[PDB]
């Protein structure tokens, strides 16, 4: 029995293991929706207004995941300002702040979750009122500074109540440079939905050609009326890949008002000169769907979910939740012995 | 060719390796692994949002690190054992201190600046790390100061993965321009560029003396490339393998060529005689990764089936 002090590592391993099992048991039950497209100037923007208008859910917890981001923005902003004070040789209006400045470097490692004693708040209020700090803020175009720096520091009263709920505009302000992804953790009909709006296309084919597999649904955005043959080639390559034989393609033909006007004035033949149908929505949409689905050639079933949509009043949540439920049911029956 | 030069030497024969350990516990796809420099500790990356470092000798998980972003594509272990570097579609390389950590997990650095996904990374020492990204660039970062200090531009397509020379003085990169490029770290530029695959090249590794290397591609071939002769030496392709290759590693002597296939197998080639020497089976889904210990005693295989297996 070579257990000597060692019969302690196993116990640790079993506690870590239990933790890994518990997060894992909960996860994987999430319904994940992947949005792709953006092959145009503004597709995901159209997606964003439809999301704003027809999608919601702001529990306390989703607002809470932005707490660390708010704090990090604030701390990094004040750090940037202080460092610029050192760089530009700006002195305190009152030499007693030199003591604050020593504390400042200490309180700068105090950047933990939600340390907002009245003393720190007063130090920040005093710095923000300083003329050299105001001078830096008004010269912020020469360095990097959140545009909302003054907005928040001037709003500390509103910001510090424990019932603060970030607005939608607050979220829009959360700064995104090169990568995004959109997340929500709302509850609805006892299902936890997770919806992801991704862009970055026109070049990231390799990320979906094989990085995705097992996802619940694809949402493919197409610019109806906004080179083109290369797009058909990319879709052919992705669409017909043997590893994606069993994955559903769901199509939201968006900007339908402009498309309906364009097909009145712009023939479908610009894209497909061999098209002999009429320039009605139904025939042109059916023809496009046919051209895409014909690229498969290796699948007896289709289960394509086609939708007929209207204006800003369209009951979207009913439509989205019915489609989620039918796909989950058919995907639960497919592997329960019944067929 | 190597084949007509080594014909006289005896073949290796019966390679019957057995599982000495089965590492159980991921419950989703594994995307990455990395041997520690002791040929004993290792890190693995899974879509469960966990980075696990295991002591492979006892079969104990040393750490399970919860990741802030789950869309991981690459990870790396610092040779000192002091740090790891985990990537993601967030374009950020997060650095984690494994030793001065007085018990909780802490972000030690967030490397920001790539404009496409971080596809690969390799440490030099606790200072500098070389990384590749889908933004078509590679970059060397000073982690302490957080700045991209060196930048390797010249690829014209997405950069897929990278391989450090054994002496860490050179590195090679493979990209979707179907090219590999050899870079000198300190001048930050390309000495040589090697083309020939028609596919994006997804994978590459080195002969142990650092004087040659082999690549593996989704085009179902492996290729041998020589630095000093600057060209392909050999192609490895069964006619009935048209599927992608996921992973490569050499045996200690260079004698064995290990290759992972979409067909659920790891074929083992005799590098000297071009005969297939062996097969690693026992998995129910794609082998996505593999590796040979620095000391040569064992090989680990990682798979789409969420399991790792240890062989010798």
């Amino acid at each position, epitope marked *: 029995t*070579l257990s000597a002090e060692d019969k*302690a*590592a196993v*116990e*640790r391993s079993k*506690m870590i293991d239990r933790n890994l099992r518990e997060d894992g048991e909960k996860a994987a039950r999430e319904v994940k929706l992947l949005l792709l497209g953006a092959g145009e100037s503004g597709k995901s923007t159209i997606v964003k207004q439809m999301k704003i208008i027809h999608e919601a859910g702001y529990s306390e917890e989703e607002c809470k995941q932005y707490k660390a981001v708010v704090y990090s923005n604030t701390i990094q902003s004040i750090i940037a300002i202080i460092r610029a004070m050192g760089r530009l040789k700006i002195d305190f209006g009152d030499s007693a702040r030199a003591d604050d400045a020593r504390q400042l470097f200490v309180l700068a490692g105090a950047a933990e979750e939600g340390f907002m004693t009245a003393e720190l708040a007063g130090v920040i209020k005093r710095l923000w009122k300083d003329s050299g700090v105001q001078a830096c803020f008004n010269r912020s175009r020469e360095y990097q500074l959140n545009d909302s720096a003054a907005y928040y520091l001037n709003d500390l009263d509103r910001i510090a109540q424990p019932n603060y709920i970030p607005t939608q505009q607050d979220v829009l302000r959360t700064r995104v440079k090169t990568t995004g992804i959109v997340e929500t953790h709302f509850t609805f009909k006892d299902l936890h939905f997770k919806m992801f709006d991704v862009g970055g296309q026109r070049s990231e084919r390799k990320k979906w050609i094989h990085c995705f597999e097992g996802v619940t649904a694809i949402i493919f955005c197409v610019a109806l009326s906004d080179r083109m043959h290369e797009s058909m080639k990319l879709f052919d390559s992705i669409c017909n890949n043997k590893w994606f034989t069993d994955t559903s393609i769901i199509l939201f033909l968006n900007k339908k008002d402009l498309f309906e006007e364009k097909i009145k004035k712009s023939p479908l033949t610009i894209c497909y000169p061999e098209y002999a149908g009429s320039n009605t929505y139904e025939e042109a949409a059916a023809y496009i769907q046919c051209q895409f689905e014909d690229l498969n050639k290796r699948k007896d079933t289709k289960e394509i979910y086609t939708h007929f949509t209207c204006a800003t009043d369209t009951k979207n949540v009913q439509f989205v939740f019915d489609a989620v439920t039918d796909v989950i049911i058919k995907n639960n029956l497919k592997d329960c012995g019944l067929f | 060719t190597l084949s007509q030069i080594t014909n006289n030497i005896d073949p290796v024969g019966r390679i019957q390796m057995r599982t000495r350990r089965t590492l159980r516990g991921h419950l989703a796809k594994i995307y990455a692994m990395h041997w520690g420099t002791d040929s004993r500790l290792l890190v693995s990356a899974s879509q469960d949002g966990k980075l696990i470092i295991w*002591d492979s000798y006892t079969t104990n998980k040393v750490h399970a690190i919860p990741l802030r972003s789950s869309w991981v594509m690459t990870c790396a272990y610092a040779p000192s054992g002091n740090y790891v570097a985990c990537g993601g579609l967030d374009n950020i390389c997060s650095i984690y201190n494994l030793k001065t950590r*007085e*018990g909780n997990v802490r972000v030690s650095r967030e490397l920001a600046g790539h404009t496409g996904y971080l596809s690969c990374c390799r440490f030099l020492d606790d200072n500098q790390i070389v990384t590749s990204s889908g933004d078509t660039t590679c970059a060397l970062w000073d982690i302490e100061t957080g700045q991209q200090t060196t930048t390797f531009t010249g690829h014209t397509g997405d950069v897929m993965s990278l391989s450090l020379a054994p002496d860490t003085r050179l590195f090679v990169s493979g990209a979707c321009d179907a090219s590999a490029k050899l870079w000198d770290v300190r001048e930050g530029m390309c000495r040589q560029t090697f083309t020939g695959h028609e596919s994006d090249i997804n994978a590459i590794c080195f002969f142990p003396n650092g004087n040659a290397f082999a690549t593996g591609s989704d085009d179902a071939t492996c290729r041998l490339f020589d630095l000093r002769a600057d060209q392909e030496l050999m192609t490895y392709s069964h006619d009935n393998i048209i599927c992608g290759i996921t992973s490569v590693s050499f045996s200690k002597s260079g004698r064995l060529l290990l290759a992972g296939y979409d067909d659920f197998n790891c074929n083992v080639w005799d590098a000297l005689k071009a005969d297939r020497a062996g097969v690693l089976a026992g998995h129910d889904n794609r082998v996505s990764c593999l590796g040979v210990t620095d000391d040569g005693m064992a090989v680990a295989t990682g798979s789409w089936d969420s399991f790792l297996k240890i062989w010798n």
Partner: single-chain antibody, 236 residues
Framework: DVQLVESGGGLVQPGGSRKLSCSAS????????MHWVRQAPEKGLEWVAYISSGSGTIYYADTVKGRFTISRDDPKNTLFLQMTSLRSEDTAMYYC??????????????WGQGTTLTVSSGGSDIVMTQATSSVPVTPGESVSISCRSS???????????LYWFLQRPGQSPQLLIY???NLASGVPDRFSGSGSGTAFTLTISRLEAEDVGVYYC?????????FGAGTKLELK
């Protein structure tokens, strides 16, 4: 900043009960095992009790099992030691000591300041022998202290479970060497350890001022953990 602050000490009548506390902050308290070690007035260190991280494993010294209870409240990051039927021989300085056990870890790497308890008036264990109780030294010279055990400390797993600690006069003990070759953080490379099986030696080169104190060797092969009596360093 890792802190362990013991409290609850004092003077107690014999036969009474007393709960000591050790308050931890600045680290992941619940991930660490915790020990109580006591030191009689003019004597060496003797291990008293252990509670594992997660409280799954608890060990007591024989002279205390059944009667004394060690416990921890991990959510409140506090360790307790409830004593009963207190005797005069329980009078000691009591240290709380943290210890995490995993491959390559450094057990016993941080000690609290300790709290003093004073009680009023009214075999299978390995014997470790340092036959020389004190040695006079002069600065700059190099010394080698030795200690031996009646059984081999080399285990069938290949490890030799030997630790060396230093207690400077009036301060808490400080870990110096773990598992024969690892330099403790912050300890100068002028310390070195050697030995074989049952006899071991710690050597200091160019001994400095701060090096003065009592040096204990210790086995961690099996419980109860046991210390040597300690070796004092006197100036000439």
């Amino acid at each position: 900043d890792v802190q362990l602050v013991e409290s609850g000490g004092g003077l107690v009548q014999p036969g009474g009960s007393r709960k000591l506390s050790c308050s931890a902050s600045g680290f992941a308290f619940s991930s660490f095992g915790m020990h109580w070690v006591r030191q009689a007035p003019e004597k060496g260190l003797e291990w008293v009790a252990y509670i594992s991280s997660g409280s799954g494993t608890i060990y007591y010294a024989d002279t205390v099992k059944g009667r004394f209870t060690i416990s921890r409240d991990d959510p409140k990051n506090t360790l307790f030691l409830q004593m009963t039927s207190l005797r005069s021989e329980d009078t000691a300085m009591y240290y709380c000591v943290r210890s995490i056990y995993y491959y390559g870890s450094s057990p016993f790497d941080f000690w609290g300041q300790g709290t003093t308890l004073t009680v009023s008036s009214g075999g299978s264990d390995i014997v470790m022998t340092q036959a020389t109780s004190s040695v006079p030294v002069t600065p700059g010279e190099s010394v080698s202290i030795s200690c031996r055990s009646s059984k081999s400390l080399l285990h069938s797993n290949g490890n030799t479970y030997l630790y060396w600690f230093l207690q400077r006069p009036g301060q808490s003990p400080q870990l110096l060497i773990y598992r024969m070759s690892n330099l403790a953080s912050g300890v100068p490379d002028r310390f070195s350890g050697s030995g074989s099986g049952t006899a071991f030696t710690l050597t200091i080169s160019r001994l400095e001022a701060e090096d003065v104190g009592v040096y204990y060797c210790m086995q961690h092969l099996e419980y109860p953990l046991t210390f040597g009596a300690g070796t004092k360093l006197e100036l000439k």
